[PDB]
């Protein structure tokens, strides 16, 4: 949610001595420890996030500062005096104290009015409010850049509706918005599409198993009518000859008619007609019956050809050949599809071909698939235009089967039984195809186009028994769309969106982690050892406290059987060296900006690249603007002192030096390390000295003790402090002048402008454009 | 009837029952044709055809 920031963050602290002679304005952004030997950019990222939290930058925000103002009492002055930032009254007090010391007169009425009116809020042409306050340069740059990045996402209500208008079906009623929301409605949304392919391509079996199991749970509950099998069985008994004493093939088909597994087969049928390639299996008995011929014939005639594999097609053909032609599995094992087709057709069996299933275009654009169309197979290989099976000779084909002779030279026991059974199966499909086609349309609307063309059936867990295959078509039940079922799908539609959004974010985070955490792997054992240990640290870190990955993604990886840590570890391996494009996000840009300013500007945060140690009797140029006594701050570390270049010694070389006593007497500069320093400017006068010693000499090496300056202001005529400074501080430590310090006289440079959007804007938390019909 | 600008529209289920076909006929019969829109008229025809 967008958070309206009430006050502009400023980090200005005004320090003035007791006499008031000197005064300075300082950034107070906090000291941050730094470490040498490790890459600086990696550390700057950690401190960048902490800086954002301090400044109210991390979360999406809009400045609300157009009401923090007042108006002067004078009639002429109608300006809006701002309140944020450093108060101009503090500057007036500091300037007057400075004037008091020099015996100058106090600021006049005219000069007082000019100083107090510097902070103002004035309207902009676009309606925005520009607030000019006294704020620091570091805070101003970071705050304004953060404002720009988040504003890239806030868009007008009409613009958002236009982008999403192509994914709204006809069933749902339109939402009516208030006219204020139409004229002044702004919605904070991010509309970058994240591809689920990186997880699906890497983990195909697991992702396929998850979506199939979840979708089957919803489909298994679809209501159907309740019809007794006796009405259909009575016709089958009459068309053939059923005797309570004789044994025939019709008894075999009818005795094993089961409706117990109807919901599972019904869920199988939808999945075959809703995914692009959802292969199905069927294992018949070792000795085929008329059960398996009916099961094989029913599968070929009604299941889509895109869901029947070439090998499964051959096994179905072999099963028909074994029964009808009376040949063994061994004889037909080496026979191909063409030889099997010819043998079956010569015997008189014409049901030896697979039939493709037509594709029906979706009425609305699929979710998470910008600028694409969707298609799902019509069930039962029934052409919607003709309302017929795709094969137009089915009536003549069934008559041919009935006349022909199989399994016996004389008699029509086999032919009449199968022709009668296929007859009821054909009638059921022609009546119920419209009901099933509607069901497939709903569930196709729950998957993006990426999942449509990527998910595959590899585990083989979804297989149909021959008993289930033929009993489903004999006892096909129509579909009743109760109001509860419609509501059930609507709740599932919302859940899928939340799951798709969560998974995309998890994928995007993981892709970014791999690029920085790991590199390329070589064939050396050093690379293998280094990669294994480093990856263990990454996995251990991301799972401490709040796991980086969500519970939605962990479930996909955990289905196989792994604990969940191993699933992410396995996935992170295959992602190394990816070429997937990742869209840089506003939050990523903000952190990069702060990190870059951390490396570029180091005096703000309390560390410096180089320090200088010089004996007291040598005079160095130092800043005199602030007025400190024996100021340890320099404009820049001198290149030459007394006509000779100042020695620069690396910290590593300095530690191992055993002659340190000799080189100290001349002075030198340490430059190959990050030096963390702090100071406490005190108002009273005194001797400026470090809290601790400069260096500690051990047997192992020499190190620089922590640097804490005790800075005091300077009064020229004080002999006691002049003698003490010279004759009690043998050595001095100098650094570059911290950029956070700013003299009071140059206070106009602290003037900075912050913009705030118009107060007339309203924010729509729920930008949904439709209502459920119920 | 009082204001010509106002319009009448209904949304039907994905699989229409006899309720929706009966309501669609009633709207096309006992409601002004000026009020019913062209897109809504096509929607009513689709429900009947389905």
Short mmCIF file of C-alpha atoms in Angstrom, two decimals, chain A residues 233 236-237 242 249-257 470 474:
data_model
loop_
_atom_site.label_atom_id
_atom_site.label_comp_id
_atom_site.label_asym_id
_atom_site.label_seq_id
_atom_site.Cartn_x
_atom_site.Cartn_y
_atom_site.Cartn_z
CA UNK A 233 -28.27 -51.92 -19.80
CA UNK A 236 -27.86 -53.54 -24.54
CA UNK A 237 -29.45 -56.78 -23.34
CA UNK A 242 -28.74 -62.09 -23.02
CA UNK A 249 -19.43 -61.72 -24.56
CA UNK A 250 -22.13 -59.20 -23.63
CA UNK A 251 -22.14 -60.55 -20.07
CA UNK A 252 -18.41 -59.84 -19.81
CA UNK A 253 -18.91 -56.20 -20.77
CA UNK A 254 -21.91 -55.68 -18.48
CA UNK A 255 -20.64 -57.59 -15.44
CA UNK A 256 -17.68 -55.21 -15.07
CA UNK A 257 -19.55 -51.91 -15.48
CA UNK A 470 -15.50 -48.10 -21.31
CA UNK A 474 -21.43 -46.17 -21.41
#
